[PDB]
């Protein structure tokens, strides 16, 4: 099930990338084309990472996983901020916090001395997640609603998908082998990550690009 699910994820991300690329080839408006560039760059990086995983590279430590996360999550955050009309400084705060969360996940997964400081890293990354959640529910949502009612609705949709899917990643991590106590197998963890990435990238981007009229 290892290579099976890696290739499932590779094909899913490649299909999402080519669909987002061919869906935006007819557009000259700067805002829409920026949205399309970022929204197609996310699953393209995801597909590159999954191809590296399934080709025997990507694992030494699942470095390609954290590469995919560290590269795509800030682009998802940039899309969220563009939709919300957020201040540049708030966007910088969100990017720093998200990078800290993902790097803390990578650390806690990479440590070996026991389950103590690994779970401490898990708690630090989860606190980064909580403050990210508070920023998305507070400042970004308020800004999106102050833009317009339609903008508030679209950002509500996108924010709900984002938070609901992101909150599952630390669960898979603390239950998974690569990060926590190995309660679920490596293949089950890879399947769950594949499905979560399919959601958080393809479906989120489909909503965001459909919502441009
Ligand atoms: C396309 C990939 C995405 C959207 C990945 C998102 C991943 C996360 C939000 C992961 C978060 C983590 C924590 C909140 C704590 C435990 C460590 C992580 C890295 C699994």
Swiss-Prot record:
Q: List the disulfide bonds.
A: none
Q: Which InterPro entries match?
A: Arc/bac/fun_rhodopsins, Rhodopsin_retinal_BS
Q: Which GO terms describe its cellular component?
A: plasma membrane
Describe its membrane topology. Multi-pass membrane protein
Q: Does the keyword Transmembrane helix apply?
A: yes
Which residues are listed under the site Primary proton acceptor?
68
Question: N6-(retinylidene)lysine is carried by which residues?
Answer: 201
Q: Which UniProt keywords apply?
A: Cell membrane, Chromophore, Membrane, Photoreceptor protein, Receptor, Retinal protein, Sensory transduction, Transmembrane, Transmembrane helix
Q: Output the PTM entry.
A: The covalent binding of retinal to the apoprotein, bacterioopsin, generates bacteriorhodopsin.
Q: Which Pfam families match?
A: Bac_rhodopsin
Main location group: membrane
Question: What does the entry give for GO biological process?
Answer: phototransduction
Its biological function?
Has no proton-pumping activity but is potentially capable of functioning as a sensory SRII-like protein. The chromophore contains 36.5% all-trans-, 7.6% 11-cis- and 56.4% 13-cis-retinal in the dark and 30.1% 11-cis- and 47.7% 13-cis-retinal upon illumination with >460 nm light.
**What is the protein name stated in its UniProt record?**
Bacteriorhodopsin-II-like protein
Q: Which organism is it from?
A: Haloquadratum walsbyi (strain DSM 16790 / HBSQ001)
Per the UniProt record, the lineage of the source organism begins with: Archaea, Methanobacteriati, Methanobacteriota, Stenosarchaea group, Halobacteria
């Amino acid at each position: 099930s290892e290579a099976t699910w890696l290739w499932i994820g590779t094909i899913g991300m490649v299909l999402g990338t080519v669909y987002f690329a061919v869906r935006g080839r007819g557009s000259t408006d700067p805002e829409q084309q920026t949205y399309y560039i970022i929204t197609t760059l996310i699953p393209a990086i995801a597909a590159a990472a999954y191809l590296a995983m399934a080709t025997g590279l990507g694992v030494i430590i699942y470095w390609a996983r954290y590469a995919n996360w560290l590269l795509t999550t800030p682009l998802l955050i940039i899309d969220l901020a563009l939709v919300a009309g957020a201040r540049k400084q708030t966007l910088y705060k969100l990017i720093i916090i998200d990078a800290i969360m993902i790097l803390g996940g990578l650390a806690g997964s990479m440590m070996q001395q026991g389950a103590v400081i690994r779970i401490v890293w898990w708690a630090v990354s989860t606190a980064a997640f909580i403050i990210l959640l508070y920023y998305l529910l507070g400042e970004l949502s308020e800004r999106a609603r102050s833009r317009s009612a339609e903008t508030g609705i679209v950002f509500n949709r996108l924010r709900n998908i984002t938070l609901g899917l992101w909150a599952l990643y630390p669960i898979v991590w603390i239950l998974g082998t690569g990060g926590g106590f190995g309660i679920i197998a490596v293949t089950t963890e890879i399947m769950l990550y594949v499905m979560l990435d399919i959601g958080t990238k393809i479906g989120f981007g489909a909503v965001l690009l459909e919502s441009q009229d």
